Scaffold this motif. Structure first.
Motif, short mmCIF file in Angstrom:
data_model
loop_
_atom_site.label_atom_id
_atom_site.label_comp_id
_atom_site.label_asym_id
_atom_site.label_seq_id
_atom_site.Cartn_x
_atom_site.Cartn_y
_atom_site.Cartn_z
N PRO A 98 0.86 -1.23 0.00
CA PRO A 98 0.00 0.00 0.00
C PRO A 98 0.86 1.22 0.00
O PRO A 98 1.85 1.27 0.72
CB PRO A 98 -0.80 -0.15 1.28
CG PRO A 98 0.15 -0.93 2.18
CD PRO A 98 0.86 -1.96 1.29
N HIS A 99 0.39 2.27 -0.72
CA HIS A 99 1.19 3.54 -0.82
C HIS A 99 0.42 4.64 -0.17
O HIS A 99 -0.74 4.90 -0.55
CB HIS A 99 1.40 3.95 -2.30
CG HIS A 99 2.02 2.89 -3.15
ND1 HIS A 99 1.70 2.75 -4.53
CD2 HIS A 99 2.87 1.82 -2.83
CE1 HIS A 99 2.37 1.66 -5.01
NE2 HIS A 99 3.09 1.10 -3.98
N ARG A 100 1.02 5.25 0.86
CA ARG A 100 0.41 6.43 1.48
C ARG A 100 1.52 7.37 1.91
O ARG A 100 2.72 7.03 1.84
CB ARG A 100 -0.32 5.98 2.75
CG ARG A 100 -1.49 4.99 2.50
CD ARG A 100 -2.74 5.70 1.97
NE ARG A 100 -3.17 6.96 2.65
CZ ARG A 100 -4.10 7.14 3.62
NH1 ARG A 100 -4.71 6.15 4.23
NH2 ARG A 100 -4.35 8.40 4.04
N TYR A 125 0.09 1.66 9.26
CA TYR A 125 -0.18 0.22 9.35
C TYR A 125 0.91 -0.39 10.26
O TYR A 125 2.12 -0.08 10.08
CB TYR A 125 -0.11 -0.49 8.01
CG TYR A 125 -1.22 -0.07 7.06
CD1 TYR A 125 -0.96 0.43 5.85
CD2 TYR A 125 -2.55 -0.15 7.49
CE1 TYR A 125 -1.98 0.83 4.99
CE2 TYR A 125 -3.59 0.21 6.65
CZ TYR A 125 -3.29 0.70 5.41
OH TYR A 125 -4.39 1.08 4.64
N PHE A 151 -5.48 -6.24 5.25
CA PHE A 151 -4.29 -7.01 4.82
C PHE A 151 -4.09 -8.11 5.89
O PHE A 151 -3.68 -7.77 7.03
CB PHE A 151 -2.99 -6.15 4.81
CG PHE A 151 -3.09 -5.01 3.86
CD1 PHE A 151 -2.59 -5.11 2.52
CD2 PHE A 151 -3.57 -3.78 4.38
CE1 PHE A 151 -2.71 -4.00 1.65
CE2 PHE A 151 -3.70 -2.67 3.52
CZ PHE A 151 -3.27 -2.81 2.17
N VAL A 206 -5.39 -5.20 -0.26
CA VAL A 206 -6.19 -4.14 -1.00
C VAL A 206 -5.36 -3.11 -1.71
O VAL A 206 -4.18 -2.85 -1.34
CB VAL A 206 -7.21 -3.38 -0.09
CG1 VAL A 206 -8.17 -4.35 0.62
CG2 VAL A 206 -6.49 -2.48 0.95
N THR A 207 -5.94 -2.55 -2.82
CA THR A 207 -5.50 -1.21 -3.24
C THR A 207 -6.69 -0.28 -3.33
O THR A 207 -7.87 -0.80 -3.47
CB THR A 207 -4.84 -1.24 -4.63
OG1 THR A 207 -5.80 -1.61 -5.66
CG2 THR A 207 -3.66 -2.24 -4.71
N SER A 208 -6.51 1.03 -3.16
CA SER A 208 -7.66 1.91 -3.30
C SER A 208 -8.28 1.76 -4.73
O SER A 208 -7.59 1.74 -5.77
CB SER A 208 -7.21 3.36 -3.07
OG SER A 208 -6.89 3.57 -1.71
N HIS A 230 -12.16 -0.27 -1.80
CA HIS A 230 -10.97 -1.06 -2.02
C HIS A 230 -11.14 -2.09 -3.08
O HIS A 230 -12.20 -2.71 -3.25
CB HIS A 230 -10.68 -1.88 -0.77
CG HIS A 230 -10.11 -1.05 0.34
ND1 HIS A 230 -10.28 -1.41 1.63
CD2 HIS A 230 -9.32 0.09 0.34
CE1 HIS A 230 -9.60 -0.57 2.43
NE2 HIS A 230 -8.99 0.36 1.69
N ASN A 264 -4.68 0.74 -8.59
CA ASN A 264 -5.47 2.03 -8.60
C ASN A 264 -5.88 2.45 -10.02
O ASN A 264 -6.28 3.64 -10.23
CB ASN A 264 -4.63 3.21 -8.03
CG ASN A 264 -4.03 2.92 -6.67
OD1 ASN A 264 -2.81 3.19 -6.52
ND2 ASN A 264 -4.78 2.39 -5.69
N1 LIG Z 1 -3.56 2.34 1.47
C1 LIG Z 1 -4.57 1.76 0.65
C2 LIG Z 1 -4.21 0.70 -0.32
C3 LIG Z 1 -4.42 1.52 -1.45
C4 LIG Z 1 -3.31 2.42 -1.81
O1 LIG Z 1 -3.13 3.41 -0.81
O2 LIG Z 1 -3.68 3.04 -3.08
C5 LIG Z 1 -5.54 1.34 1.25
O3 LIG Z 1 -5.21 0.71 2.29
O4 LIG Z 1 -6.54 1.97 0.93
#
Ligand SMILES: N[C@@H](CCC(O)O)C(=O)O
Lengths: 216, 535
Positions: free
Chosen positions: B22-24, B32, B58, B68-70, B178, B242
């Motif tokens: 996941p990218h934030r 997380y 996750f 998940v990804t958004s 998600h 995404n």
């Molecule tokens: N952080 C994301 C996974 C999706 C990513 O950030 O696009 C999520 O947990 O929503």
């Protein structure tokens, strides 16, 4: 001396049986309980041992109280979550949950509050702020979860296109979106490709006209 | 965020493998945390959100793994409202109805309390503009509009034994949209769009829309069973990153805006090329640094031809010759990034878009960044040679000016050093003498927001990485102790702990550490052990 004790034994009011928490070479906690209520009590206690400042700062950001710790930089974000009604929608949601999810949340915050009562030294950030931790209610976890994902995605692109309208005009503003490489790879069906729909200025004309008037 | 699942016919193990990241934003401590939690009803290991019970997104439970990804479903509408009554009434159809007004107050450390109005119409609260002026914007979001039962899913998901049981357990999840990718010990893989999305017109996706006309109202919810899903596709590969989930001719409106398909296409390419995908192969995909723009850049800079200014011509030549990789060791990747930041700034300034945020309707915390949004649209405009927003400049004139400006901004650092994140603890600016203690250590890293190793940036601020993988993982479904994971700093939130920043070393190398599931191994390897006992 400024870290909480991670060995020995600590009491949690409300536990039915012991819970064993083992940390591996990277400090990652592996928590083994008997029943489910004890598992969630332990998880609230273990989250607080490693992450209590994060937990309280994220709850303050959800409840519009983070400028009390962060100053003016956080004032406008606090006003926005008060206007969105965070406390109202998280209490709403909690009241509507099934017994199993209410009992999960109650057990989890009992674990958090036992940590706050355990006599551990406070984290370094509470020393710097001259702060003391405030206790947890079951619906607080719903506010923390809602804050993690607050307003992500589409709302910013729409706001941006609206702001671009009086600057570059409708036709240009409606091209302001992330690139598609010329043609998207779709997720479903896997491997499928398709060209996205572009904006229909004719069907958007009443919205564009109303916004230009409102903005001008 | 990226993830993918490979079916048993395409893995080295003959069982499913799932992996991702996941990218934030790199807020500290990380959003997380790694935990393993077992009782008589379940035994789960995965990522938790400190302050929330359970494993929302996750985890595996020894039978089903999920991540998940958004999804970039459109779950938030803005309505332009007409007010009267000095802001106390709002139009719906041909009637002006009472608006709710109340007062609230916040305290601010070091300053005066701030009192403010909360104004709410049938759509939602006013978030921008002054109703007293006759018009303002309200927000109707799935995150607030109606009772949400996502927390009932957290007690149902741990019991699932198959991909299909896990998707039934997620019924009613609406807090966040998600792409829920799953795999199970029966050998299935699947992708569900786990979201609640209202049924309304595609026009609502483009702009704030009239709140009074009745044409843009939500007409109920898209039913659970109508949401896109696939289980066991015939090509044996699922990827989400995404990118647009379904085509826009899908009968329900689900999406206007999403990421470009670069990362999904690169992961899909690497997986289609490897029909014996092994657990060890996930790290090489996580680490991929090929930029999708090298071809467009090379073509446009070659056609532009030699520049008069000697430093700009040097930069042009290095960019035409570049292999396109955002590797940490590459000095020319830094020059690409400086060039693209300078081009984005020049386009945002010339178009007039930098000042678009001066309007009162822009005032929604934390605000939009004009350069940050224009950054992602430039490739489309440059590929199409659409100079409509450049007020008379051609793209060639913009590219030439960008070579000149960027040539004065070349530090010569390798991209890993130029892009190294400055992890900033939330109190470091208030307590600057403490920043060396509070800020976790960081190592050089490559990638940008277009590459699978998606260490992105804030283009108006500079090249430093501001967001990227908060964790990376791989699940070996059915040989669970061979699964692996890592987070970008460490388990501890305490600046003085040995575990505050220790996982930054593997994470910066795109390596992972074991995700241990077997209790006898965990017991044998434990460094501290604690008993939590009845009181
Ligand atoms: N952080 C994301 C996974 C999706 C990513 O950030 O696009 C999520 O947990 O929503």
């Amino acid at each position: 001396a400024a870290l909480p004790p991670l060995s020995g034994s600590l009491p949690i009011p409300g536990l039915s049986a012991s819970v064993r928490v083992r940390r591996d070479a990277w400090g990652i906690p592996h928590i083994k309980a008997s029943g489910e209520a004890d598992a969630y009590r332990a998880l609230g206690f273990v989250h607080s041992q490693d992450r209590l400042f994060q937990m309280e700062l994220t709850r303050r950001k959800a409840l519009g109280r983070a400028a009390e710790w962060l100053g003016a930089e956080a004032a406008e974000a606090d006003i926005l979550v008060r206007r969105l009604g965070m406390e109202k929608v998280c209490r709403r949601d909690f009241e509507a949950l099934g017994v199993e999810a209410k009992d999960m949340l109650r057990a989890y915050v009992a674990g958090v509050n036992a940590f706050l009562a355990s006599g551990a030294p406070l984290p370094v950030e509470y020393g710097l702020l001259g702060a003391e931790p405030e206790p947890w209610e079951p619906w607080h976890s719903i506010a923390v979860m809602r804050r993690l994902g607050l307003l992500m995605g589409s709302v910013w692109f729409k706001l941006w296109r609206m702001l671009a309208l009086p600057v570059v005009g409708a036709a240009n503003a409606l091209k302001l979106r992330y690139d598609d490489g010329g043609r998207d790879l779709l997720c479903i069906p896997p491997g499928a490709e398709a060209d996205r729909l572009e904006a229909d200025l004719a069907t958007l004309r009443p919205a564009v006209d109303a916004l230009l008037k409102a903005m001008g | 965020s990226n993830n993918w699942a490979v079916a048993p016919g395409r893995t080295a193990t003959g069982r499913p493998i799932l992996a991702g990241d996941p990218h934030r934003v790199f807020e500290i401590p990380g959003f997380y945390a790694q935990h393993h939690l077992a009782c008589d009803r379940f035994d789960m290991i995965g990522l938790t959100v400190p302050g929330v019970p359970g494993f929302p997104s996750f985890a595996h439970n020894g039978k089903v793994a999920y991540c998940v990804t958004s999804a970039f479903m459109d779950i938030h509408d803005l309505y332009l409202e007409q007010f009267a009554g000095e802001g106390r009434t709002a139009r719906f159809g041909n009637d002006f109805e009472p608006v709710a007004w109340s007062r609230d107050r916040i305290a601010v450390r070091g300053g005066a309390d701030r009192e403010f109005d909360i104004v709410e119409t049938r759509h939602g609260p006013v978030i921008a503009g002054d109703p007293r002026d006759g018009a303002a914007l309200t927000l109707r979001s799935v995150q607030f509009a109606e009772t949400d039962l996502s927390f009932d899913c957290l007690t149902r998901m741990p019991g699932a034994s198959t991909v299909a049981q896990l998707y039934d357990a997620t019924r009613g999840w609406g807090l966040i949209d998600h792409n829920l990718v799953a795999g199970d010990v029966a050998g299935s893989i699947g992708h569900l769009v786990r979201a609640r999305v209202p049924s309304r017109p595609r026009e609502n996706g483009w702009l704030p829309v009239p709140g009074w006309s009745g044409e843009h109202e939500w007409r109920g919810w898209i039913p659970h069973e109508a949401m896109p899903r696939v289980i066991d596709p015939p090509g044996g590969i699922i990827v989400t990153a995404n990118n647009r989930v379904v085509a826009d001719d899908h009968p329900d409106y689900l999406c206007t805006d999403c990421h470009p398909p670069y990362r999904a296409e690169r992961i899909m390419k690497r997986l289609v090329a490897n029909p014996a995908f092994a657990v060890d192969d996930a790290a090489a995909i996580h680490a991929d640094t090929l930029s999708p723009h090298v071809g467009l850049l090379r073509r446009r800079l070659e056609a532009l031809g030699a520049r008069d200014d000697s430093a700009a011509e040097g930069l042009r030549q290095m960019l035409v010759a570049w292999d396109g990789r955002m590797d940490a060791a590459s000095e020319v990747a830094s020059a690409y990034n400086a060039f693209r930041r300078a081009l984005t700034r020049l386009v945002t300034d010339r178009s007039g878009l930098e000042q678009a945020i001066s309007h009162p309707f822009a005032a929604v915390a934390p605000g939009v960044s004009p350069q940050g949004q224009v950054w992602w649209a430039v490739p489309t405009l440059l590929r199409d040679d659409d100079a409509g927003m450049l007020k008379g400049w051609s793209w060639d004139q913009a590219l030439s000016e960008a070579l000149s400006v960027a040539s004065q901004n070349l530090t010569g650092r390798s991209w890993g050093e130029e892009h190294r994140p400055r992890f900033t603890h939330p109190l470091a600016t208030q307590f600057p003498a403490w920043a060396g203690l509070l800020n976790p250590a960081s190592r050089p890293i490559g990638g940008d927001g277009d590459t699978v190793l998606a260490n992105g940036l804030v283009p108006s601020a500079g090249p430093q990485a501001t967001y990227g993988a908060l964790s990376r993982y791989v699940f070996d479904v059915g040989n669970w102790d061979n699964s692996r994971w890592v987070v970008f700093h460490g388990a501890s939130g305490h600046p003085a702990s040995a575990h505050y920043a220790d996982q930054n070393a593997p994470w910066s190398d795109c390596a992972m550490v074991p995700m241990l599931y077997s209790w006898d191994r965990i017991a044998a390897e434990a460094v501290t052990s604690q008993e939590l006992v009845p009181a």
